[model samples]
Target: HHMLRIGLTGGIGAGKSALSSAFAQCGAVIVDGDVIAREVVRPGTEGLAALVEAFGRDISLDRPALAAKAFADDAARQTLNGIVHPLVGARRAEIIASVPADSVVVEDIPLLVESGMAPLFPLVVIVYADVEVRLRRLVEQRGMAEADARARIAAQASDEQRRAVADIWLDNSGSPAELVQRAQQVWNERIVPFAHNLSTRQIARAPVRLVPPDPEWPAQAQRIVNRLKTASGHRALRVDHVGSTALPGDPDFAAKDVIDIQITVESLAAADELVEPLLAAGYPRLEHITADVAKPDARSTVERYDHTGDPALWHKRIHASADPGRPTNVHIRVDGWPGQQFALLFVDWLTADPDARADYLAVKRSAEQRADGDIDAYVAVKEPWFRDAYRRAWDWADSTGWKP
Candidate 1:
């Protein structure tokens, strides 16, 4: 939990090494995958022996020849990968485990996107350049054959695919100095503070300012959901994207910059069991927030029961992101609990009913104005409107036969 693991990746000739060097100068412990990959296959290792046995050739002497044979066919590549991948992974883990507790470890992986390993890190930085630019670098600077450079470029993941997993994208189309400057800025602005926050268990918070709906919110929530699902493993019944930010194409539904995610668990005990794993996943539990604001049963007409109910039934866990760039709130609730169900229902009702969405937005704006940047006060001001909305949302759900 003390160390911050960041994934750094880029295609060939994209200046990934330059950016990583910049991060290194900024005090990040660079775990270069290329170096590790070569280490595992050095003269005397099991990786080299296996390669020799599989291909009936001495790959320890000439790696280019081995690559030529390996890339000739799918079977050869699989055989080569079968030998090297595990060795590389083992060495990578060993190096990571040996790092200092508070270190910001930047893992430079070239095939991160292709390997589907982006979600493993709390933050993924992708170095990117135009295909033409990369080809020029490889062919002119590296002295690779034009055809070989083109083939190498085509073999890797496309720009669109890389963008899907990238939390931070560094364009390396300009001079190496520009790339270094950008990397330095990212280190100072996000990485240093993120590592400090993770080590100190400090949650990132933002002022209560409503902004227009972002088309990227859903994708951002999905990335967080993927991370939470990976962290919680079997403990999570389901991980969902909830709250106003989850709603897409609703231009009128402006929301705070925080992404709200719901992790449904079987019980409060199961949620408790996920504390360490979630923390390692960069979401430190907020110990003081033991439950949500209990809402009364929607069917009950008693005015006295409003915002008053069995606190035990509303019991839950909460975590917030340590990454300063993205403010996130993770609500861990028992499956089928009022808090869990309402979180889902509220988003759905708002999505389905424009009138309700408009009303809620109005209330949020009014609360924001009245609270004047205090998050707690803003929530308190909006509680009354939420109490009424709970009843109305449930009414609409009943009429429409909505299911969470």
Candidate 2:
């Protein structure tokens, strides 16, 4: 069983509650801070007794009075929190333990970053709304006085503080429907798959099949490239859209809309350095795929000595996006290497050579027909055709003075 504890936070009036509710609808076990805080300070609890000691029995019984007193002074607020927070913490621990080990728990802690507790979870999501919008919502919907709402917002952690510690950030400045839709998209695309990946202790399995081509594939690949560029800095060398999606003019082919991106780096060691950033960018590492199993044809090695004898030379790294709607595969290969050179040049070879493009498409159709939806079987059948194409691509490269 795998347990994935996610810390979810947002300032008051930032639509955190709405997002949390959406997560609940998607099957997350929510551990709410507000509910736990209230439970701790109930009539006869030690938390209430401590409050009595700190600010008299009157403050202990009167919620508004206590809030007014504490928020008016820094020392008083700290003292209030000092007494309540530990009780809340203990209660939260108890609730977490009560849940199943495999549960995807979203702990809603509004002061998560402010309390310096962001690092406690492997994933942290920050819900954000502009201060003015938040202020309007607080005053109109929650019926707080403008001055009180402003004071409350100012008392909480700043946007910069929250963003610094966020793994996922959700914006809530739009309509409620838009916000809910965004929540669903995030939940279905990133959150669910991420939790499943953690539970299975696997990054992602390569998706099987050749579905109808998506008109959106190129646009999606460009967006992914921009994200990869940010994640890898200039070390991404050249991020290009490869595979069937990159094929020009849609030569009657079908493939899974899985966008294949080849990111060339200086070396395999450099590729290793990018794992964290790529993970941060929501493309988690698919474990231990160091070497390219689908290598270029052995017979086509015209310059056999050009190949470095080091086994490390042939290795590559892979990462996949957990976003189910827009599945992406990222290949990190060393620049000037066989895999890198071949992938980069192949797209161009197919684009420029109409005959080869039609031939490859025909092979793809035949593979899919032969396998009848068995992806490995399809790939197995297509290997020889790819080798022949590789030979022709090299021939085209030689005659056209091509450079990778």
Candidate 3:
């Protein structure tokens, strides 16, 4: 069983401590990154010894002295991080392992985005307070000088950077009681339900709806890829941005502003094994689709294109994110399979050939219009055109010596 890992972070005076306490009150197992960072550098530890070696033994017993030296220069900070982060990572893993398999672990990592560990969790909840609210809270509540508070905020990752990685954004400008209520709602609706769904291998697919294209599609796709890389690790042999969002040239193609990503693994077994990990990483299994439904008849004998091999050979596993704001689809395929090969080849062919892309777009629009709001019917009509396009794409691949 895999625990549901959630990353909880915020700026200095953003009420992260209060929000974390609320989450803990709601029964989440809290893991504080700041605590671990401190534990890794306590007196009598190798972390302290390493600091002593670099900054001299006099700074060992004095905490403020050590921090002053570390923050005074980039070289000192880098040296300090080099000694502390590995120890922190190991301790974090151990703490997570010690918990129950089905635990809902909320890791309160303040520097999540700064350390590039934002993608490591299934869901990242970022609590944000406006600069004014933060400043007031810092001076009135924490008793910090206004100038010092401003300096603290300036030193950390910016709001825009944190927004790029957040799955849930909690606005903390309201009263602490109101924020606590919101946290409870999030736990009941999202966190608990997500953990239950993953533990049971429940299939959750995104709705098929088309919206106008957004220019931010590539960045969103990259974020998803980064998150998937952390979840799937080395087993994610190849991950690519696909579909209309990733197409080159003119942005004339009608799309849902949705991101389509493909991940290729060593085998079908590997793909199946990844189902749970993916769900825990914010993508629930859409279905256990074993073959490519490339034809109207939806059978092995009727379909064409790269799916012409044995029915079992064209296997793939589909997963879609439940994130309502930024929808995503994840297709997991086996290496060397026809379905896998065709997906890679099709995207490249369309990218390099504008005429073919225009024709495909025309067919797609025609299919959608003919279906009259039926997603299934739209896809049904589009398959035959894809078959024809597949043949042309393969021809282009062969002529250009394209290899996967």
Candidate 4:
């Protein structure tokens, strides 16, 4: 009990006995239940006195040791439990209290779970094997009657039952070295950390804060739009004030300043004429147009269109499309392409559904609740929820009232 407890157990011939020895060699405290049950019910201990009061002294073991007798007979098992359960419980509690801050104490209890003593330990492990190998080990090498041993092996819970309760499964169907290897692995990986985590205390490291995005958003966008309109002079069928603000708490938004624009344009060619206008407006149009543009990666970019013609930066996201407004920032995706209609549908759906708007607002607020100041991480967290909404919206759209 001096070391933090690491449970190591298995079915018959899964080599738990051998592997447990390895754990002992690795310096863990070893609690062999078969050895201790005897000491708990000493002839003068409270255990024996209680057992005598319950089942009588006639239930005392005929075997050389009290622990041996406890597992050998059902009546003796009850007697052993009557005597030892309390002592073991008290001892285990003492062990838990006294174990070092980082020591791994391994306890080997064969019927730990069956005895309903699994709660005594922080971590439990189960060793297992293929049924055929297990049956063969008990019947062949151990020299027990094939039928009797198989039944005895089968009498215990199935592998799955034991595995279900186990935090680690030690596979011991191979060499003794392999079993030892597995035990060492568990000692280093599971038991060591398991003990440390139990000892370590965790607390929140930082205070979270919520701050609003730039407040100049709508008007700043209006300024950009006015610049584009004055230069190109095309009326928009509908200019979308979209993206996350369109919700709430979307820090991806530029504190109400950097507005995401979606303007309707008549044709791709007409939309193409705005290279000069977007620059004059301060929302310089990035001319990243390539017929064979590869799919977008952070590094995947071509040429860009700048108003001053200083140096062109390819547009990674924003683009012009073929809707109606000549000076608008359009995506130019044709109507039949799924991407072409998706952007339009998302805007229309958000405007049409207040519940969705409120939901998005809540998500934005929750996501930006901490305001990490990194725009990309904030978007990354909210994008999953936004994408899910689109899935739900897409399913609804396919049902009826389809408009693109």
Provide TM-scores for the models: 0.89, 0.56, 0.74, 0.44
lDDT (10s digit) by residue, model 1, range 1-404:
35788999989989888988989988889998789988988888888888888888755448888988988887999988888889988987887688776788888888899988888989999999988999899999999999999998888899888888888988999987888789999998988888788888888896689998888887788788888898888999999999888876677577899999999999888999998888888888899989777666523222332344566777899999988889999999877767888899888888888888888889999999999989889999898898889889888977987876
For all predictions, the C-alpha RMSD in Å is 3.7, 8.8, 5.8, 24.0
* Candidates arranged by lDDT, highest first: 1, 3, 2, 4
Q: What tens digits encode model 4's per-residue C-alpha lDDT throughout 161-193?
A: 676556566787787787788788867765554
Q: Sort the predicted structures by TM-score, highest score first.
A: 1, 3, 2, 4
Worst 10-residue lDDT window, candidate 4:
297-306
lDDT of 2 by residue, 252-327 (tens): 7666657789998987778889977776565778887788755433222325524445555577998887545456
Q: Kindly report which residue stretches of model 4 are placed more than 4 angstroms away from their true locations once superposed.
A: 1-7, 42-60, 63-80, 94-101, 107-122, 140-143, 202-404
List the candidate 1 regions with Cα displacement exceeding 4 Å: 43-60, 64-90, 298-309
Who wins the lDDT comparison? 1
What is residue 53's positional error in candidate 4, in angstroms?
A: 7.5
| Clashes in predicted model 1 | 0
Global Cα lDDT for candidate 3: 0.79
Global lDDT for candidate 4?
0.54
